[PDB]
């Protein structure tokens, strides 16, 4: 899965591309934590969210 592929931050992931693949990668990044695979949380309104591979990687 492309979500598992990214195991190999996210702004640098989604920088040099159009909204298409940038947003696809961001969406998969958000999805893969559905069962706590990474750790991430945004308390501030609008800025970066940092996550690293965790329990299932």
């Amino acid at each position: 899965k492309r979500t598992q592929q990214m195991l190999h931050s996210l702004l640098e992931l989604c920088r040099n591309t159009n909204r298409k693949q940038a947003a696809a990668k961001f969406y998969s990044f958000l999805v893969l934590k559905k069962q706590q695979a990474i750790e991430l949380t945004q308390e501030e309104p609008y800025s970066d969210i940092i996550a690293t591979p965790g329990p299932r990687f």
Partner: protein, 353 residues
């Protein structure tokens, strides 16, 4: 007006006092299945005075975090929203509940039902409007039923349907008055015009609008919308037929109509009922439901250059070519615990090239 900040307390997959915002003109959101994304729309609908009788709740006790399993996080849970617009009124609304009792708040004060109405239609939305409130499969729902129910729902939106249950009982007995009376007849066209000038006024408006709406969705000349009334003097007594001629077809009835186009017709009808007393903000979920990628780009462009005048838009989508071009990609993500919880994080596609 533009919406900025939203505060939630103790709803489905919503544990914590999270404040959410700000927002923009056309904000899109995407996430995993069952990520509480539809619960955002549930909160938006509830904070604006929902019926609270059709939201998976018995009366008020199943609308709490883990409520219909027997483990509510508390007996109280509430939303507050920040509405900012012209007139320098950056006000806030709030819907709170304790036990089986509910309470309204306008800028943190006690508010009852009819006062909420007199301040709500001030915003331009009727107590029985519910016009723009979308569902996960709303665009797959309105088309299937017979036209009579569409007539009923399109007549109840103009403060008219609340007296049909007494107008219907008028006619069949007045024949006896005809058989022998005239005072009642001379007063009987009063309710007749109370129906006509109240319903047909918006009826003709939406009938005119649907044409350019379907065009803006498709820009196909042969693709034309037609809300054909039957017996226009008493149209709501029967069904009102619809004909959404696709670009490659002709005028065809609703019987042998292809399913894959009912989504576009339903969206056009949504924007048509929008044309009648529009709401300053839009909610959309699962726009890539049954509409293939062919028309998804046209639809997405139609909204994101259609909602730049007075009303903003909130949308959920899945197909790639949509978020190839949108301007905001906010997200909500789940997390485990004693039950399901969700947390809000914000990226905007405007920064994405």
């Amino acid at each position: 007006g533009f919406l900025k900040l939203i505060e939630i307390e103790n709803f489905k997959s919503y544990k914590g006092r999270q404040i959410i915002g700000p927002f923009q003109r056309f904000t899109a959101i995407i996430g995993p299945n069952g990520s509480g994304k539809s619960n955002l729309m549930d909160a938006i609908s509830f904070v604006l005075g929902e019926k609270t009788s059709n939201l998976r709740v018995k009366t008020l006790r199943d609308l709490i975090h883990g409520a219909p399993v027997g483990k509510p996080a508390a007996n109280r849970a509430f939303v507050s929203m920040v509405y900012s617009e012209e007139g320098a009124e950056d006000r806030t609304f709030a819907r709170v509940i304790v036990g089986g009792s509910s309470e309204y708040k306008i800028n943190n004060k006690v508010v009852q039902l009819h006062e909420y109405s007199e301040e709500l239609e001030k915003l331009g939305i009727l107590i029985k409007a519910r016009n723009f409130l979308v569902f996960q499969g709303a665009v797959e729902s309105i088309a299937m039923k017979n036209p009579k129910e569409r007539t009923a729902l399109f007549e109840e939106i103009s403060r008219s349907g609340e007296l049909a249950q007494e107008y219907d009982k008028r006619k069949k007995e007045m024949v006896k008055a005809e058989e022998d009376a005239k005072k009642a007849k001379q007063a009987f066209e009063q309710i007749k015009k109370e129906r006509f000038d109240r319903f047909n006024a918006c009826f003709e408006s939406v009938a005119t609008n649907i044409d350019e709406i379907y065009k803006a969705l498709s820009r196909n000349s042969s693709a034309q919308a037609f809300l054909g009334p039957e017996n226009p003097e008493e149209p709501y007594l029967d069904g009102i037929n619809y004909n959404c001629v696709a670009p490659g077809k002709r005028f065809r009835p609703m019987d042998n109509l292809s399913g894959g186009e009912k989504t576009v017709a339903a969206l056009a009808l949504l924007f048509a009922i929008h044309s009648y007393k529009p709401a300053p903000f839009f909610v959309l979920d699962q726009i890539d439901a049954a509409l293939d990628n062919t028309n998804i780009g046209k639809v997405a462009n139609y909204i994101k250059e259609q909602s730049t005048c007075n009303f903003q838009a909130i949308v959920i989508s899945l197909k790639e070519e949509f978020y190839t071009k949108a301007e905001s990609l906010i997200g909500v993500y789940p997390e485990q615990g004693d039950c399901v919880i969700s947390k809000v994080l914000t990226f905007d596609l405007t920064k994405y090239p």
